[PDB]
Design a protein around this ligand. Structure first.
Ligand SMILES: Nc1ncnc2c1ncn2[C@@H]1O[C@H](COP(=O)(O)OP(=O)(O)OP(=O)(O)O)[C@@H](O)[C@H]1O
Ligand SMILES: [Cl-]
Ligand SMILES: [Cl-]
Ligand SMILES: [Mg+2]
Ligand code: NA
Length: 378
């Protein structure tokens, strides 16, 4: 039986398996090759993944997301106390550990972060089992390089709770490097830069690889910079467009804003491969249809400062590693947001025209590498 590799993301998770000489990134029941790290509780059922995120009658208080921001932290951790202010779900204190509190089947319940993340991992396990046609019992799971012992432990515990023997916890950037076969180099140092822009976070990592041994030389980035921030620029843009056109403010109608935000995420993805996108929402506010469009160039303007801000952390990482641009051997794109053409241009220009490694869907590279390493360890 094959073991699986799982990228347990802040916003999207991905599962792959190595068999018959090659990695298969496994699509879920809706055909999506990555799955939202969402769990929802209703009066009748628990929903995970696409079903949780896509609720037609979504209940903000009982739909949990961002558990990765809590996992392995103390309740009194200032990161937790800050993050709590912007979530619609309740976080409580159980002996200086955080728990997320919800209503389920009519009663108030609370769950540790590693419990919420185990539900996401169970979904990923099941996605794999459907494809393989047998039970999966071993996995490699990835984490950010900056994770500490407590965060790594809680992640491993989420795996155990989901019925997985965790062969190893490995760093996300190391997994992306493995996906591209960069661990296979002989003796002699090669410097690799991983540029990772996901849904919620931005991670720059510089790795030295020598005869298959990885050293983390430098890390930089921003834990509150990702695709969702580009979403929010589009939402604010269209809220102003609706005001102009209909003389109505929709900003305080939570439902209209969620429905607009979903459509902005869909348009954004489309703008990575087309130069314009149409956005059409039936009865968005007080029965008014909102049918409009957005160009790639306009989307770029709306986000220009955010896109540009990704480069100073690259500069910083290089200084910390005591390396010049020219001394990086390989540049690897990771994270869904690096599909954005403008982001690719900025990083390529900064590196004076160097090739980017982008042949593996960037939001799949970490799971791909995890799957490769899981097979080695078996
Ligand atoms: N083609 C695309 N163009 C632009 N953005 C995209 C595209 N495909 C996915 N995204 C965006 O990528 C983001 C998710 O990326 P990813 O799957 O790397 O998340 P992740 O692994 O959870 O990372 P993090 O923990 O940083 O959120 C979302 O904001 C999503 O809209
Ligand atoms: Cl599914
Ligand atoms: Cl479900
Ligand atoms: Mg990540
Ligand atoms: Na992911």
């Amino acid at each position: 039986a094959a073991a699986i590799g799982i990228d347990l993301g802040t916003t999207y998770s991905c599962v792959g398996v190595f068999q018959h000489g090659k990695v298969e990134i496994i699509a879920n029941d809706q055909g999506n090759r990555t799955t939202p790290s969402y769990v929802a509780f209703t009066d009748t059922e628990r929903l995970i993944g696409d079903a949780a995120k896509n609720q037609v009658a979504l209940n903000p208080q009982n739909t949990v997301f961002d558990a990765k921001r809590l996992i392995g932290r103390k309740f009194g951790d200032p990161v937790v106390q800050s993050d709590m202010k912007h979530w619609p779900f309740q976080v409580i204190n159980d002996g200086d550990k955080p728990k997320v509190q919800v209503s389920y089947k009519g009663e108030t319940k609370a769950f540790y972060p590693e419990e919420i993340s185990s539900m996401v991992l169970t979904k990923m396990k099941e996605i794999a089992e459907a494809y393989l046609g047998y039970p999966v019992t071993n996995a490699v799971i990835t984490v950010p390089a900056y994770f500490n012992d407590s965060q790594r432990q809680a992640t491993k515990d989420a795996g155990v709770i989901a019925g997985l023997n965790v062969l190893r916890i490995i760093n996300e950037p190391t997994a992306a490097a493995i996906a591209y076969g960069l661990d296979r180099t002989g003796k002699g140092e090669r410097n690799v830069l991983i540029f990772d822009l996901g849904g919620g976070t931005f991670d720059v990592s510089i790795l030295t690889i020598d005869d298959g041994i990885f050293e983390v030389k430098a890390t930089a980035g921003d834990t509150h910079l990702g695709g969702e921030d580009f979403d929010n620029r589009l939402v604010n843009h269209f809220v102003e467009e609706f005001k102009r056109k209909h003389k109505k403010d929709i900003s305080q109608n939570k439902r209209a804003v969620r429905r607009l935000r979903t459509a902005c995420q869909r348009a954004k993805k489309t703008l990575s491969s087309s130069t314009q996108a149409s956005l059409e929402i039936d009865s968005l506010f007080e029965g008014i249809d909102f049918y409009t469009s957005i160009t790639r160039a306009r989307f770029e303007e709306l986000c220009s400062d955010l896109f540009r801000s990704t480069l100073e952390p690259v500069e910083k990482a290089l200084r910390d590693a005591k390396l010049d641009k020219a001394q990086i051997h390989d540049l690897v794109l990771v994270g869904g947001s690096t599909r954005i053409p403008k982001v690719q241009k900025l990083l390529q220009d900064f590196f004076n025209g160097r090739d980017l490694n982008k042949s593996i869907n960037p939001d799949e590279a970490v799971a791909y590498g995890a799957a490769v390493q899981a097979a080695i360890l078996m």
